Design a binder for these strands. Sequence first.
DNA 1: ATCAGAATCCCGGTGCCGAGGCCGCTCAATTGGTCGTAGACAGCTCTAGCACCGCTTAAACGCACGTACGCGCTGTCCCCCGCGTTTTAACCGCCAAGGGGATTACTCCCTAGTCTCCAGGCACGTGTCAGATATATACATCG
DNA 2: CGATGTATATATCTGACACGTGCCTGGAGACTAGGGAGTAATCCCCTTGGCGGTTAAAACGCGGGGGACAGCGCGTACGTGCGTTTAAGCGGTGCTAGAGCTGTCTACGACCAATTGAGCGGCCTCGGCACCGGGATTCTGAT
Lengths: 107, 108, 96, 96, 79, 79, 94, 92
Amino acid sequence: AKAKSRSSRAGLQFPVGRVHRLLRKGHYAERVGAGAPVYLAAVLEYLTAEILELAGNAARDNKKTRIIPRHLQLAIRNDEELNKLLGGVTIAQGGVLPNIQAVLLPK
Amino acid sequence: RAKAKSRSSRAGLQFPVGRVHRLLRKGHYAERVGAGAPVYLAAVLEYLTAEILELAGNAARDNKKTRIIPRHLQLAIRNDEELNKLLGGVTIAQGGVLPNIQAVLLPK
Amino acid sequence: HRYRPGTVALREIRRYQKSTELLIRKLPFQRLVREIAQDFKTDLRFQSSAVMALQEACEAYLVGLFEDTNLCAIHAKRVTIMPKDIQLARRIRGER
Amino acid sequence: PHRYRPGTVALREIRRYQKSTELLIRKLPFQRLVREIAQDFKTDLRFQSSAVMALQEACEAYLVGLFEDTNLCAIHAKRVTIMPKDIQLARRIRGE
Amino acid sequence: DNIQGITKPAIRRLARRGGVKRISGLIYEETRGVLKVFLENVIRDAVTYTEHAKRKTVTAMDVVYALKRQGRTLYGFGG
Amino acid sequence: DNIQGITKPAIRRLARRGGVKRISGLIYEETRGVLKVFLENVIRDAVTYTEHAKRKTVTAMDVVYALKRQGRTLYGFGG
Amino acid sequence: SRKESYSIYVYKVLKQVHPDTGISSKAMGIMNSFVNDIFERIAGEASRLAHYNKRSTITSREIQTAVRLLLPGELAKHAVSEGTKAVTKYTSAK
Amino acid sequence: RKESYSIYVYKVLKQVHPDTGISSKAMGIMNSFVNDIFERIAGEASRLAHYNKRSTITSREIQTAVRLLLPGELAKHAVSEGTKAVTKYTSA
DNA sequence: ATCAGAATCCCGGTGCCGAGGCCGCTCAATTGGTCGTAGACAGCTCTAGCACCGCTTAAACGCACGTACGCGCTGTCCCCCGCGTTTTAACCGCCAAGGGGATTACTCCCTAGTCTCCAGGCACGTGTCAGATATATACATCG
DNA sequence: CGATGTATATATCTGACACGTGCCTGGAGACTAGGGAGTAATCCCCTTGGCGGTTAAAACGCGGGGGACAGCGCGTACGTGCGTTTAAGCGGTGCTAGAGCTGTCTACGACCAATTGAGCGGCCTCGGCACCGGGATTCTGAT
């Protein structure tokens, strides 16, 4: 007689039911257990928040208020765990970190 | 009911079309599998097997032995300029290495 | 008036690591892709985004190769990168 | 007394060990080192007899590969001896 | 002869982004050859995807997929 | 202490197989260091598979799967 | 022609982390592909960890083990903590 | 029972070098090689089906995967073999 | 150059444990078959890609020139390679024994399947304030 | 000490972001059927345990000359700066190939079933290999 969302049950922002559907239609297995999409949503939300916090701090260092891809590059290439997770990836518009080798700078 | 004639013997193959079709359906690759997939795949797997064994037997003959052993498979795979590309990351147990000395190391 | 060697190359390095525009010209690359592709199939057609995605991949790949090349160059105690530095880097990376 | 020149035997060792296919590290000490590392991630582990051979084959193949890369780095440096910097360049270009 | 459109200045600037302080005069033609190989190894895959779809127009998803199978995943033009 | 069970002549023999004619004496502790970082990685993955199975013995398949995941596939031990 | 995307939920999380800050549509596209990529990695290794044990389903355990295999060590602890915190809330709310 | 490809490799061996036998160590390597290339080809065939919103893997998907995974000359002869096999099987 | 003599080579014999044949046998492939469907084809239609036009001035090009850098010859000393005697723990093999991998028969509680209906979020319309652009100009840096 | 680089401040303005609206198709609430996984009990094999002995290999010392690498020299290769010239980028007019959607229907492959012979596990063996040893040749290098 009333409807309340599974993500608001879980206390998550990301959609549980969409992940559950995408799993079942991805053929990854012939069964999906009821707890998996909650766990997976929590993991993805955690990693999203971890990226966005660093991007926000990079934006504040520029005193900008709009996040743009350069700030995501500055986030990913400055956390030793994120960089190890995201090594085989190129980010469009992202550029590189300012990183002259020590032998090149003058005496 | 007709006497059976295995699909390998219609295709003219030794590889097991029945088994490879089973493994295509059971492996969760896609929700439907057509009759042209397993014959083509089994034919290509036969081709690559015969390709490797034809080179390996030549090394075995040069070793003057009647048996193929892993050293000969390593000699085959690493000598062919294209099989070395397909199996470039693969390492073979007991296989060793190709004889390789840089010209600068040897005496005048 | 004249600046000495390397002092403006240093300004270039600091600039282009600060800047983030694409550095290859669009039109010449756009034709180069068509010239290469027509040897595989004539009368092809291209979405305007596919050329930009190619140009992004090509610039990023070359920048990474020049990084490894510069390390190979300092190991020989040079500062000039050499063609053999490219060849060595490509060999150790395992593409040559 | 008889004495070969320096390196006359070193080449003979190369020619001898590239021809063969045996394992070269001592089995018992290697197994003890494996059991010493595994004790960190769990306690009272056991290892099947083939698992340690699989580890030894993997590790010996890895080190032979690193040594060929080190030798190319040393030759590029205009040297015959391999030194630690050649490992440290090899691992960085490989991305380790 | 469109490969002349990758000019020497366009190469130098990419070497600057990579950190190169001093550039040898023989580097450019090797760099062009390397790029030609990379382009061919990506376009051949893109065109194979275009043909299996029966399309006559290449789509940017094809370039993304050519890179992804080849390991060099690209974020931004698709997902 | 068991790190010193990998003796100096064993390192010599491996460098000989890979074609190394002359070796500086500092290499040995570095090699013991590199080997240790390699072993730590593989064993960590092996135990992770062993635990999900609720086994107490490490099996050869755990090592084969770990090495495939790391991207340096081993042929010879089944799988 | 409707397209699904995550373009609501990234914005919601951004409002929780920094309610002053906006995001460009390009960076939203990047985030969308980042989510699709890590999703495909985890779902892949979970399916492998099922088939190695000759199991048929994916449970929370396969996700947890995939999470420990793929993520570096400091991420892995905190992720597994809040995965189990989320699941305990879900199974107690019921 | 651990089903294996061993009998089929042995039949193929006895058509290229009829004097030669093969050790169990080499046979286990071949048995792993077959499984590896099978998994790779079925992988890419699945992706090609999914991207075009098709439900089905046909001979076109296997052909296209073969042209993507193998080097060029191997791809040519693999396609020539599969084409001949499927043509003669259709003629049956 | 050459020949003293060390290691590689090659030719020969012994005997064993691995590959290969036959055997039982069973379970995974075959054939005959229906039927739900999605995908092969027909038709439409409206996006955005290719073709062509004039204008703009930013970029590319060829050249001069100056000195910073890579390549070369040289030295030296110290540390590694080849050789010797000692000694220690590896390697082989025999005898114990029991933990835990691997298999089984019972059971259940978990997930896929189904109809619903209603509201979440995805097209489509809007407008304003964050930014780029422009102008202005300050002081940091470098030979 | 001379004088060119990027940084910072005030203002314009125009469109990308951020919001509001309709609505429809994706999700949630509830009941259902039946089989994938959890369980208790077992077997037995292959893993961990101890011991002897000899003898391969590792360890510790010696000798010394060939390598690593620190130094001076040098001539040219490429960074810097300028005037010439050219075509990439822009705004726009124009069309129509083909990408994307709706409609029809029928070719085909998912899933069942009865059937049976192709492929695996086992014992056996006999001969190819390996282990063994002896004599000839190559090659390093001492004089």
